[PDB]
Amino acid sequence: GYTVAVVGATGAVGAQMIKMLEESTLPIDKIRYLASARSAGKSLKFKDQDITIEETTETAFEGVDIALFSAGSSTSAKYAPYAVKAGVVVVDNTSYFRQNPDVPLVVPEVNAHALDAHNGIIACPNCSTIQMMVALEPVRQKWGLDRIIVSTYQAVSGAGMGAILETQRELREVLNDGVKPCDLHAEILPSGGDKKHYPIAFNALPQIDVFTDNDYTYEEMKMTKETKKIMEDDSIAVSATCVRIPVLSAHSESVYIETKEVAPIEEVKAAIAAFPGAVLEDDVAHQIYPQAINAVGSRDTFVGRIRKDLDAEKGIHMWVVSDNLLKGAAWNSVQIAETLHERGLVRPTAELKFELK
Amino acid sequence: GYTVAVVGATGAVGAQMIKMLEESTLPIDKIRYLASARSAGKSLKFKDQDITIEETTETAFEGVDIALFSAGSSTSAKYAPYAVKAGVVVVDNTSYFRQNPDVPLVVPEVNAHALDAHNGIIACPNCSTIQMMVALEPVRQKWGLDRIIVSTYQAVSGAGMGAILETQRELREVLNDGVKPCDLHAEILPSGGDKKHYPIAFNALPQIDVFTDNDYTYEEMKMTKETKKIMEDDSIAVSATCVRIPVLSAHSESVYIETKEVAPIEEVKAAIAAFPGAVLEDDVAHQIYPQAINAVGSRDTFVGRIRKDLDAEKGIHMWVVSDNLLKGAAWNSVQIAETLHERGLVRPTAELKFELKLE
Ligand SMILES: O=C(O)[C@H]1CC[C@H](C(=O)O)CC1
Ligand SMILES: O=C(O)[C@H]1CC[C@H](C(=O)O)CC1
Ligand code: NA
Ligand code: NA
């Protein structure tokens, strides 16, 4: 069996990484929980066992076979290369390594083949991208993809544990204290690292991450660039609007595509139903469609509202929902680790391609 | 001055109709509040005056100059034609008459000209359509519109008082009692008239109104058909996805357009800023964009996140927000009434063009 380390064990994704590992088939002989200095010495469960949390350092990775990182891009940048030097295979949830050509950016149902040539780091895409890829890959396989326009409805847990607490507190202030939403005080959302913070309670904030030079946010640009890398096709046109709404868990997406060839809607529905990881929930006669509250706790990605555009011959609209901490993060990561195990890919990398510090 | 009746005075829109009339320039000599048998005999204020609510009937409109209806499609179908027969000019918030060729479907900043030939009923479009029209008309004027793709983020007050209360109750059960959102009991949302109801708390429901036979909902198809009528151009391709989210007031929209001519973003921002009823809130260097919580209580429509598509030369994305009970409903209606007054159009219609349903 493996020694597995969870880096960021105390965070929102980390807690789900623990659950997904507890529920995993991976043969784990030893589990280690790593976080920051302020968490060291605390205890968290692995099943029935008490695990003492350790500080993450450049020397903490000796003897580790697999490390799952979800402790912020800074932490991956600092420590993942030391892990690789120590002989670890890293699965990274952060954005840091995603566009490095030496790093596979993987959704196992779509591009598991990219794992074979890994150099010790495998990147998990962002939540919003992952669920979109699970929904769209079976369509691309049969009819191609020319363009995507997506508008998202993203849950606050994607911004971490603090964002969840901020949202709950704000809603209580409005509902219990009669505070006007526009009068609420915010400290984290829309983006912890940006200059100004705004309430999310009873609001829709069209900003996730910070703004890039082209007036799209980094979240929107990640959907664009990650799609192109995962589907191995720079010709797919992708433009996104990424919006935070008052939901704690599960992202929803209104997704428009134009295919290369006309894709009959009943065949599109069947292709999605048949695709591993995607579940068709589409029966409008009985008001059946994906819902955030129903998706929470499931590893599946749910697709419905599938219908042709009213005018564009090759246009199709749909609604895609998945738990953003599960398929959107921790489950995609554990699934990658399970796929590495299946394929005999859990072993030290000989050539170090990642600069130390 | 005018005698003005508010039909549906007690509902979510009706309360804002009252506020908008209290703040109006219209010369009002007499106000009447009409509702159903449920509220008849109760009292509501107009400014400092107590007004007794009356049950709406086919004979309730004698002496009325202007009637503002927001009491559901069936109420407009039943009573608006009797109001017209009585000599009233009706401004209707419901969907009932919107697609009738004898009925102007008006957003005053866009197609006030259509009021001139009214036949006693002027229809307000749906809230989602109204704010989109305010944002897009100044763009259409200069560079044309080939297509629109819109995804909405709609507030629950659009579904009425009961839906507001349901949303508040559900959120309290989760946040104060620790109820799982899945375990919540719903009675109204997504659509009061449909067969099944779902929680809205911590959810996003991709259903507004009921489904039509093409698998789009009636709300989505209203955005399509109303856009074509208001802009007087059946060639504009419009497809919509309409989603309810946990917001009490103000709808937000992610709007994609393709123009006929390339429309430089800096010029688009200036055109929207200059357009009556539209306010540019777009300064990403300082994280300025429209927000539902800031739009509440304002008659303006706020537009930002304006940017060109990454690939389509003529594509533009934006974010449009307005208070759905104000510009989306009560303010559009009062603004129409003020515009009728300005144009000398408040007077009886001789020829009845609408079927009477209570004979
Ligand atoms: O993984 C990433 O690049 C981001 C991490 C934070 C996420 C959020 O704020 O919802 C968005 C994606
Ligand atoms: O005015 C209309 O046709 C509809 C009335 C109900 C509204 C809602 O449920 O938010 C949507 C628009
Ligand atoms: Na499937
Ligand atoms: Na067109």
Tell me the three-class secondary structure of A107-148, residue by residue. CHHHHHHHHCCCCCEEECCCHHHHHHHHHHHHHHHHHCCCEE
- B299/B47 Cα distance (integer angstroms): 20
- Contacts A–B by Cβ distance under 8 A: 179
Residue ranges lining ligand 1, Cβ < 6 Å: A 95, 126-127, 154, 158-159, 208, 219, 222
Say which CATH class A1-124+325-357 falls into.
alpha beta
Residue A125 Cα: closest atom of ligand 1: 1
Judged by CB atoms closer than 8 Å, whether chains meet at B207 and A311 is answered as no
**How far from A34 is each of A18, A333, B262, CA to CA, in Å?**
12, 16, 53
Give the active site residue among B118, B124, B242, B251: B251
Nearest to B240 by CA among B320, B331, B297: B320
B176 touches chain A (CB under 8 A): yes
Copy the structure tokens of residue B99. Answer: 């697609």
Task: Enumerate the residues of chain B whose CB falls inside 8 A of the CB of residue A293.
Answer: 181-182, 199, 201-203
| H helix and E strand count, chain A | 9, 13
Q: Where are the alpha helices (DSSP H) in A253-302?
A: 265-274, 292-295
**Residue B118 amino acid letter:** H
Catalytic residue numbers of A read 127, 251
Are A73 and A97 in contact by the 8 Å Cβ rule? The answer is: no
Taking each helix axis from N to C end, the angle separating B161-177 and A161-177, rounded to the nearest 10 degrees, works out to 120
DSSP state of A336: H
Chain B residue closest to A310 (CA)?
Answer: B239
Copy the structure tokens of residue B128. Answer: 């989602």
Mutate to test the interface with B, among A167, A172, A200, A202 (most CBs of B within 10 A): A202
Residue with tokens 């002027």: B122
CA distance A42 to chain B (A): 27
- B31/A140 Cα distance (integer angstroms): 61
Torsion of CA A274, A277, A282, A287, to 10 degrees: 150
| Residues A101-104: contacts with CB under 8 Å, at least 24 apart | A102/A353, A102/A354
Q: Which of residues 116-155 of A touch B (CB under 8 A)?
A: 147, 149, 151, 153
Residue B218 Cα: closest atom of ligand 2: 3
Q: Which of residues 240-279 of B touch A (CB under 8 A)?
A: 241, 243, 245-249, 252, 254, 256
Judged by its nearest atom, the ligand closest to the C-alpha of residue B193 is 2
Give the one of B171, B205, B311 whose C-beta lies nearest to A175's C-beta: B171
A190 prior amide bond cis, ω within 30: yes
Parts of chain A belonging to CATH 3.40.50.720: 1-124+325-357
Parts of chain B belonging to CATH 3.40.50.720: 1-124+325-359
CA distance A254 to chain B (A): 7
Judged by its nearest atom, the ligand closest to the C-alpha of residue A188 is 1
Give the one of B176, B310, B319 whose C-beta lies nearest to A224's C-beta: B310
Give the pairing of strands B49-55 and B28-35.
Answer: parallel
Parts of chain A belonging to CATH 3.30.360.10: 125-324
Residue length of chain A: 357
- B222/B229 Cα distance (integer angstroms): 10
Judged by CB atoms closer than 8 Å, whether chains meet at B291 and A256 is answered as no
Judged by CB atoms closer than 8 Å, whether chains meet at B205 and A256 is answered as no
Fold of B125-324: Dihydrodipicolinate Reductase; domain 2 (3.30.360)
B172 touches chain A (CB under 8 A): yes
Distant-in-sequence, close-in-space partners of B287: CB < 8 Å, separation ≥ 6? A190, A194, A195, A196, A198, A207, A211
Q: Starting at the earlier edge strand, list the strands of the sheet with B237-241.
A: B237-241, B147-153, B251-258, B315-322, B301-308, B278-280
Q: Which residue lies with its CA nearest to atom 11 of ligand 2? A: B158
- What kind of experiment solved this structure? X-ray
Give the one of A175, A216, A239 whose C-beta lies nearest to B311's C-beta: A239
**Residue A109 amino acid letter:** E
Judged by CB atoms closer than 8 Å, whether chains meet at B245 and A241 is answered as no
Taking each helix axis from N to C end, the angle separating A127-143 and A218-230, rounded to the nearest 10 degrees, works out to 40
Q: Residue A285's Cα: distance from chain center in Å?
A: 32
A289 touches chain B (CB under 8 A): yes
SS3 letters across chain B: CEEEEEECCCCHHHHHHHHHHHCCCCCEEEEEEEECCCCCCCEEEECCEEEEEEECCCCCCCCCCEEEECCCHHHHHHHHHHHHHHCCEEEECCCCCCCCCCCCECCHHHHHHHHHHCCCEEECCCHHHHHHHHHHHHHHHHHCCCEEEEEEEECHHHHCHHHHHHHHHHHHHHHHHCCCHHHCCCCCCCCCCCCCCCCCCCCCECCCCCECCCCCEHHHHHHHHHHHHHCCCCCCEEEEECCECCCCCCEEEEEEEECCCCCCHHHHHHHHHCCCCEEECCEHHHCECCCHHHHCCCCCEEEEEEEECCCCCCEEEEEEEECCCHHHHHHHHHHHHHHHHHCCCCCCCCCCCCCCCCC
φ, ψ for residue A293, nearest 5 deg: -65, -25
Residue with tokens 């309670």: A201
Q: Which residue lies with its CA nearest to atom 4 of ligand 2? A: B126
Q: Which of residues 202-231 of B touch A (CB under 8 A)?
A: 202-207, 211, 214-216, 224
Q: Which of residues 24-43 of A touch B (CB under 8 A)?
A: none
- In chain A, which residues are followed by a C-to-N distance beyond 2.5 Å, i.e. a gap? none
Fold of B1-124+325-359: Rossmann fold (3.40.50)
- B338/A69 Cα distance (integer angstroms): 62
B290 touches chain A (CB under 8 A): yes
Chain B residue closest to A179 (CA)?
Answer: B293
Contact B122 CB / ligand 2 (< 6 Å):
no
Q: Which residues pair with B56 in a beta bridge?
A: none
Judged by CB atoms closer than 8 Å, whether chains meet at B254 and A243 is answered as yes
Question: What resolution in angstroms, rounded to 1 decimal?
Answer: 1.5
**d(CA A276, ligand 1 centre) in Å:** 24
B313 touches chain A (CB under 8 A): no
Copy the structure tokens of residue B342. Answer: 């300005």
Q: Which residue lies with its CA nearest to atom 2 of ligand 1? A: A126
DSSP H or E segment with residue A341: helix A331-342
Task: Enumerate the residues of chain B whose CB falls inside 8 A of the CB of residue A304.
Answer: 206
Q: Which residues pair with B252 in a beta bridge?
A: B153, B321
Give the one of A204, A247, A312 whose C-beta lies nearest to B203's C-beta: A247
Distant-in-sequence, close-in-space partners of B264: CB < 8 Å, separation ≥ 6? none
Contact B159 CB / ligand 2 (< 6 Å):
yes
- In chain B, which residues are followed by a C-to-N distance beyond 2.5 Å, i.e. a gap? none
Residue A94 Cα: closest atom of ligand 1: 1
Chain B residue closest to A225 (CA)?
Answer: B310
- B81/B119 Cα distance (integer angstroms): 11
Chain B residue closest to A189 (CA)?
Answer: B287
Burial of A75 (0-12, 13-18, 19+ CB in 10 A): buried
Are B46 and B109 in contact by the 8 Å Cβ rule? The answer is: no
- B84/B64 Cα distance (integer angstroms): 10
